[PDB]
Swiss-Prot record, chains A, B:
DNA-binding region: 28-53
Consequence of gene loss (knockout): Strongly reduced shoot growth, and slightly increased root growth. Reduced expression of phosphate starvation-induced (PSI) genes, decreased cellular inorganic phosphate (Pi) content and shoot-to-root ratio, and impaired anthocyanin accumulation.
Family, as annotated: Belongs to the MYB-CC family.
Natural source organism: Arabidopsis thaliana (Mouse-ear cress)
Intracellular or extracellular location(s): Nucleus
Protein name: Protein PHOSPHATE STARVATION RESPONSE 1
Complete-protein stretch covered: 226 to 282 of 409
Residue intervals of the HTH myb-type domain: 1-57
Subunit structure: Homodimers and heterodimers. Interacts with SPX1 in a Pi-dependent manner. Does not interact with PHL2 or PHL3.
Post-translational modification: Sumoylated by SIZ1. Sumoylation controls phosphate deficiency responses.
Induction entry: Only moderately up-regulated by Pi starvation.
Highest taxon listed in the record's lineage: Eukaryota
Task performed by this protein: Transcription factor involved in phosphate starvation signaling. Binds as a dimer to P1BS, an imperfect palindromic sequence 5'-GNATATNC-3', to promote the expression of inorganic phosphate (Pi) starvation-responsive genes. SPX1 is a competitive inhibitor of this DNA-binding. PHR1 binding to its targets is low Pi-dependent. Regulates the expression of miR399. Regulates the expression of IPS1 (At3g09922), a non-coding RNA that mimics the target of miR399 to block the cleavage of PHO2 under Pi-deficient conditions.
DNA sequence: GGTACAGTATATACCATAAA
DNA sequence: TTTATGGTATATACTGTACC
């Protein structure tokens, strides 16, 4: 299937990234392990963090 | 093949986008037709303009 | 009701580096 | 010399809309 970043999933992702101390500091694997979401791969998080990083700073 | 945005190709792409009056105004097809580069598809330009747009404004 | 396109989201491939 | 990872570049899929 193709992942959809629903506004909940994204809010999870953000809280995660904040805990990790901002988008720049945060790591894919780190975000992954904090979210603990069934079926979410590292590759899902990696791509999305890449966007999140650019649409921020 | 997989396209590589060599610093020349990119300089072409930019001049194009400028002629078209900035990244926001510019269109994939428009940039395409101004560059007139053998083997360059609209899909190449589309993706790259998407990046150019975010790493600018 | 089918193109052709723009805009956007997501995925995938590349490239370097560290650790073993 | 593999494996795992992060960063990054590029590609591919989705969604709407205008035109015909």
């Amino acid at each position: 299937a193709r992942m959809r970043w629903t506004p909940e999933l994204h809010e999870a992702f953000v809280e995660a990234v904040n805990s990790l101390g901002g988008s720049e500091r945060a790591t894919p694997k780190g975000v992954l392990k904090i979210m603990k979401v069934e079926g979410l791969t590292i590759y899902h998080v990696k791509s999305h963090l890449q966007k999140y990083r650019t649409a921020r700073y």
